[PDB]
Design an enzyme around this catalytic site. Sequence first.
Site, PDB file in Angstrom:
ATOM      1  N   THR A  50       2.559   3.386  11.160  1.00 13.04           N
ATOM      2  CA  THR A  50       2.374   2.024  10.678  1.00 13.04           C
ATOM      3  C   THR A  50       2.216   1.954   9.164  1.00 13.04           C
ATOM      4  O   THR A  50       2.505   0.905   8.576  1.00 13.04           O
ATOM      5  CB  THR A  50       1.157   1.381  11.348  1.00 13.04           C
ATOM      6  OG1 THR A  50      -0.040   2.043  10.920  1.00 13.04           O
ATOM      7  CG2 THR A  50       1.278   1.417  12.874  1.00 13.04           C
ATOM      8  N   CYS A  51       1.768   3.034   8.518  1.00 16.67           N
ATOM      9  CA  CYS A  51       1.619   3.004   7.067  1.00 16.67           C
ATOM     10  C   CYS A  51       2.963   2.965   6.356  1.00 16.67           C
ATOM     11  O   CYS A  51       3.032   2.514   5.209  1.00 16.67           O
ATOM     12  CB  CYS A  51       0.816   4.215   6.592  1.00 16.67           C
ATOM     13  SG  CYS A  51       1.698   5.795   6.667  1.00 16.67           S
ATOM     14  N   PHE A  52       4.025   3.421   7.014  1.00 12.11           N
ATOM     15  CA  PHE A  52       5.390   3.230   6.550  1.00 12.11           C
ATOM     16  C   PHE A  52       6.079   2.100   7.297  1.00 12.11           C
ATOM     17  O   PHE A  52       7.258   1.832   7.050  1.00 12.11           O
ATOM     18  CB  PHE A  52       6.189   4.530   6.701  1.00 12.11           C
ATOM     19  CG  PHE A  52       5.558   5.710   6.022  1.00 12.11           C
ATOM     20  CD1 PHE A  52       5.318   5.697   4.657  1.00 12.11           C
ATOM     21  CD2 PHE A  52       5.190   6.827   6.751  1.00 12.11           C
ATOM     22  CE1 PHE A  52       4.735   6.779   4.034  1.00 12.11           C
ATOM     23  CE2 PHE A  52       4.603   7.912   6.134  1.00 12.11           C
ATOM     24  CZ  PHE A  52       4.374   7.889   4.773  1.00 12.11           C
TER      25      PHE A  52
END
Lengths: 127, 446
Positions: free
Chosen positions: A103-105
């Site tokens: 989710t961070c990308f």
Amino acid sequence: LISIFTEQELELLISGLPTIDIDDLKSNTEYHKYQSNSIQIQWFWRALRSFDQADRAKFLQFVTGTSKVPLQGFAALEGMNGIQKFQIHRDDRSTDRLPSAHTCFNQLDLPAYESFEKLRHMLLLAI
Amino acid sequence: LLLDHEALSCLLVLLFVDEPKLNTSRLHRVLRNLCYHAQTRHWVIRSLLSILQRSSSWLSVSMDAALGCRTNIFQIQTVHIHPQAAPVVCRHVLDTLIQLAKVDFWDLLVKLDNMEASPLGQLMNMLSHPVIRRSSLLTEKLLRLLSLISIGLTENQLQLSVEVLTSEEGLEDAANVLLQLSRGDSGTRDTVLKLLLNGARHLGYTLCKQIGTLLAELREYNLEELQLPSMSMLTSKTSTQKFFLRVLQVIIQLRDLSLDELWDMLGECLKELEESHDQHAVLVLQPAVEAFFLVHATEQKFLRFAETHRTVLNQILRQSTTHLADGPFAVLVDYIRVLDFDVKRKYFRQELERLDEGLRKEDMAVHVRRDHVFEDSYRELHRKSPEEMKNRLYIVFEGEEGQDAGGLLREWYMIISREMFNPMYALFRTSPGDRVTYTINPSSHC
């Protein structure tokens, strides 16, 4: 009594179900190894259009880590390194494993599932 | 002996004449007061019961029974009641007997014209007799009566046939009768349980036949909305589904019926309704599903059912206004993956209201200044009780004009959800990776 909700559903209960402009998401989708006319991708857009608002929100939370919709549209979708568009990656591992999210990308790795029905079942079980 | 049998017979002739003005409640209270004398009561009741059995010139009373038929209520030739008037004589006599249950006549009657627990056996036989067995009203009244009195094999068979054949109030009085009878004797308990099971098996066999027609016609409909005529005999208010469910609810009320040929074909029928791309099409099997989860999921097979039909049981519950935690489907509270989000949200909001239903909720003011709202709220509320918080908060901003309290509350809540994430309170900080989420600030010890 709150424990009847999921970790997704508690967010959707507190902040509400968002309205997802799937045209805005599609306009802010990046295809890496799939293409926008791949059959599994046409199945993806058909599936996500067929999912109700709660399963769409659960997908957005699953892949972005939140149900929060950017006010400016998904063009303003933030990631770890600045504005990051949504993105679908083909997972070249075996197609008997679930899709996976970073989710961070805002990153989806998606195996090349052989059919609409199977892809829909695997995605719905993931979300 | 306040009154003799000729004066009582003169009063009892009033039960036959159907006059709307006549106050028959006053006549019932006269008969009730007269029936405090035990011998009067006993003769009155033995006469009223002879009137019911005989339902199943001064005495020239012409009652309009049907069109072009004005019958004489009395046929004297040994006194008979003309069957057209009978249902009204029955209705007035059962109306009187319901009060006497809360608390020769013919020969005397012709002599004029020329000028609790023992008879329960007669009243249970009475259910077999045609003028009563026809009329849903007389059946409902007689069942109310039996339900009052209740406070042998054929007589229970005749009470149960009232359920295997056709009155929700009358069948709830039949439930009361069959329970309070079973409270009487372990032997009547056993015979009524086993004969309920016998009737429920008959209902189940013909329900499996009906669903077999439904499934076959859904096959023939697809293999080339749903208004399959096989559906009509399931939609019916008096459908075997409702008879079967009624009988099972009574069986389960007596517990304090082996049909896998029914349950597995209810199974494949539900699966073939859901695959047939129609949704409310399931609801014609909802009472059979509720029966399934009654017989199973005793206060596993029901879990595999709720899995393989998950979205179907959700369509059922979502359509049903039966409150999830008061109906039969309450058991699945704890296996929650088998429900929809909005079903769980409804269950949440209703069960929450159930627990706090004893609380009277008031309105409650919260006085804050626009520049300090966060700390004013902390001071005002942080020592308030949960039940005072559960009051409806209305917010007054110092010196501002009045405005709609609902919009002002939504704004106030919005402002609070912002001020929560001002670093000046040090309550929440953004994930260094995402930068749009928020978690507890590990620097709030300042």
